[PDB]
Design a protein around this ligand. Structure first.
Ligand SMILES: [Co+2]
Ligand SMILES: [Co+2]
Ligand SMILES: [Co+2]
Ligand SMILES: [Co+2]
Ligand SMILES: [Co+2]
Ligand SMILES: [Co+2]
Lengths: 407, 409, 407
């Protein structure tokens, strides 16, 4: 499955600098495959089998592939991922004007590593809400061009730099985007208004608020002497989003399938959607108890320069295939029946499979196995995974999507 | 008018991932412009009006533009830059095999900022020395392709990462280039040999040693909402090398002109070369006292997230022109005469000029008077530094006015 | 307006020293306004145009305005606030007898500031559960009188008192209520029986258990040279409770409206009440997705003596109007659409509006905007707010309640 798959990933990451864009990319692909969009606000006709997707807040998406069999007999085959990643968001009154520069004050979304955000050609994307012709409207904008940089302080002026210092997100992370007069006027909402005309043709009476993420304009790429790796932003968790979608779109059979890609993992929807798919009563409970959730989120590869952060018996290899993640304290829902099932699936697909627990010194109600492709450096602005692993994961999710029996 | 310089700089940086490659790029352009190479091993016949360059270790270059009058009478105009930048160099027995990976051990060259080298698509380039059927060869290689990465450790396994930790070069900086295990012979010198075949159609008997730097494969680029900035590796100090060379090739007037770009600044050539110009005896000392060296190396612009690392009266602006660097404890050789001269020179060429002095709580065995100047930058010694998209034009104009200058102090 | 609104607030705080008392004060206001209590054990018949309220544990209240067009088309407009505040609670067996004094052991409720509770004329109020003719009753009591003091230790005996010491809640916070003889014997439940007789004309067989809060007997008050401020206990969050009830009672139009004042916010109901207001499980998601929750809870005004605790670009000003609270990491669920709407709603209702974000180094599935009035000294026994802001908040909350169209 190539190469083609790895190229599909790179394009998908490119089109998705935010959870909003991620969602839009998933939906345009779902639509090209003939899934019809449902609006939660409207009444649903619903025809049995039955290809649908629904969004919430333009940043969460559920894909529903209804099969021949009653979900009360066959249960659901659910794959879960998330559409968000740690990053830096623009503040509501962002303009900072000092030493000739115009900067934008940012907050740190999620458990982001600060250091890798320095010295990158960053751009800006996300959702803008504005008033046009009286009505409230929302669009996505993506500046595409590299408009921003968080420069490092020179080592000459910070000689114990490599000894480590607590990077202060308030002081040290606002990006520079331009130079000002001064005195010159600076209106970031005016800049967004320009970007609305430019990107959308819309003229806008005033710009109200926004959810804008800086991101790396350097694309994901295949790296390594023998091309054994993929480097890029947002692998956690768009690698899983892409994988599950590719598995859903190419799945054999007529099983009841769901793809759930939710927002804010990194900080109800599925339940309300499912309760609408089912004639209420014991139907919900009977379908869900026959179901299985494969929760796909990146795993930690044992890192060669940091090998002792891992249990020696449980250090996943990049390109060694999907990792089954166990944690007895319910950090992962995986148990012997869901783990045993997934393990059996990989064997029948001839896909290699690994295990991970952490070092011991470190709500729908569905059965769940937690898996993930091994990865280095989450959540940096540029994470690392293996170039063989996407084909592995797509193979077994596709096998799972086509599985008649579940535990 | 300004954008071709910047385009040329981006091209120059791309072709120069190492000091060896920068010297090669500089030399290629000089030859295209009519400068001819002198070998230091050989006798020189230098006629006036002549255009020469000189090379040492394939990583230092001196470019000579001999003028109408003897340098004994009218002096030298000298611009200095350097061809090296902090980076990671491959060790001589580099193969590290563990957890299924192949890695290359690296030493840190210069005062590199470690953290920015993480999570970068790295490639490998430099000089390779080998024995071929059966003589001693040196060639330059550039894998071009992204072959290596130094991944960060996940924050889940280093939760107090943003509080800082002392990054250990021996431990945390060896890059991953491939996967091994279940076997398997890993021999780096053999990989170099395939790279010799692939790049030069050359095969080798045995590869002996090599000087190879890892570099960022992401090109330099113009950035900012109004394109005010240039980002890239090696702005320290290929920015000045470019600037100096553009200015040398296009400067008007006669006048004796010198471009000196030396290696190992980040850690005798010039003096020996200048002496082989001019007659024996007192000719040298007399020429040098009528001479002036503009040492061009990047300055620090005042950083708006770190503004108090600067003196509030001496905070250079990106795109505010060349900076005169003063340190009366001779960290810079600038004195009031050479600073005065350069200031006069900028004012005549309509080029804006700034001053820098360090916060007070923080050549030349030739004996040439010197002014130290630089274009203001951020993130000096990072894998990716920042500079003004306007400053290069500013610098080339004033160096051009310097090379054309009739009089010196 | 304003002076009358502020007097109403003051009276409300006085009437409400506990969650139980806040709920009772809300309940008797609504009933005066014609709202009829719905018992959760009963079956409900709700007509259009209905005005209802329902309580739980006598300390949470949900008031409901049913309009004419169905929640399936128009959704609900919901205002959220909470009934509780940080304070000190009497323990089950509280009598401490030492040094001639009677004291009551107290546990610290919520994230209270300890120092301000010292040297205050405290009283005691809350719920008493007792047995009367073997029947088992609960009544509210309010001693009203200043019956307790937690005195500071004199600076002469604690000379570095101004250097700060860790205040130990178990040791330094039990208040003094009386003096005791040599061996005089004290029974707190006996004093509670006398208060039952005193306040309700009731004798108890035996007093069983209780939930009693100490509170300051100093009334809320307008303060400042130009009367720009209001000072009082429990401004977090009875300020919002009061503002929401005014807004609900005076709201024009006939749209579907909810006021949610819950208990225990400072350490299920809403969903269960909403589900009983509309048929299927398809109707729930449809109506909730068309709804909007303005979650109203005090924000932090930038304090002139601690101004560096705020972001310089996001320092809300007392009497500056409601504050839209923002946090990408969902400490506040505000997004660009619900912020846009609220900002619009303020600007075309002529109320000034402010944004808040923290310094970067510091459910039922409904869209939400977190907003609050700017406040000083939050979780102290005596908090500070603007004497102009309550009028602002009531104005825009009413504007909200009369909004036909929601994001
Ligand atoms: Co994840
Ligand atoms: Co993550
Ligand atoms: Co330098
Ligand atoms: Co340097
Ligand atoms: Co509160
Ligand atoms: Co509170």
């Amino acid at each position: 499955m190539r190469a083609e798959l790895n190229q599909g990933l790179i394009d998908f990451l490119k089109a998705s600098p935010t959870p909003f864009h991620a969602t839009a990319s998933l939906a345009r692909r779902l639509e090209a495959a003939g899934y019809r969009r449902l609006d939660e606000r409207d009444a649903w006709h619903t025809e049995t089998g039955g290809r649908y997707y629904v969004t919430r807040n333009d940043s969460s998406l559920i894909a529903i592939r209804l099969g021949r069999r009653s979900p009360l007999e066959s249960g659901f085959r659910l794959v879960g991922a998330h559409t968000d990643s740690p990053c830096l968001r623009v503040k509501p009154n962002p303009e900072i004007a000092r030493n000739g520069f115009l900067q934008l004050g940012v907050e740190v979304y999620g458990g982001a590593l600060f250091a890798p955000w320095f010295d990158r050609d960053l751009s800006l994307a996300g959702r803008v809400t504005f008033r046009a012709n009286g009505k409230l409207e929302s669009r996505l904008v993506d500046f595409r061009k590299a408009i921003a940089v968080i420069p490092n302080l020179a080592i000459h002026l910070n000689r114990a730099a490599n000894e480590g210092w607590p990077i202060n997100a308030q002081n040290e992370l606002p990006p520079i985007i331009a130079q000002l007069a001064p005195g010159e006027a600076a209106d970031f909402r005016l800049l967004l208004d320009e970007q609305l005309l430019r990107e959308h043709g819309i003229t806008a009476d005033v710009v109200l608020d926004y959810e804008l993420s800086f991101y790396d304009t350097q694309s994901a790429a295949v790296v390594g002497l023998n091309d054994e790796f993929i480097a890029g932003a947002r692998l956690d968790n768009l690698l899983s989003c892409h994988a599950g979608l590719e598995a859903l779109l190419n799945a054999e059979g007529d099983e009841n399938c769901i793809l759930v890609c939710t927002d804010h993992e990194e900080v109800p929807f599925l339940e309300q959607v499912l309760r609408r798919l089912l004639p209420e009563g014991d139907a919900f409970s009977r379908a869900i108890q026959r179901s299985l959730l494969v929760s796909a989120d990146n795993a930690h590869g044992v890192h060669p320069n940091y090998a002792d952060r891992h249990d020696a018996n449980h250090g996943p290899a990049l390109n060694g295939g999907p990792v089954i993640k166990i944690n007895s304290n319910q950090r992962y829902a995986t148990n012997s029946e869901t783990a045993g099932f997934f393990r059996h699936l990989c064997q029948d697909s001839e896909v290699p499979v690994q295990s991970f627990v952490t070092r011991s010194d470190m709500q729908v109600g569905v059965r769940t196995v937690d898996i993930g492709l091994p990865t280095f450096a989450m959540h940096s602005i540029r994470e690392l995974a293996g170039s063989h692993d996407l084909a592995h994961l797509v193979k077994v999710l596709g096998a799972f999507y086509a599985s008649s029996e579940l535990p």
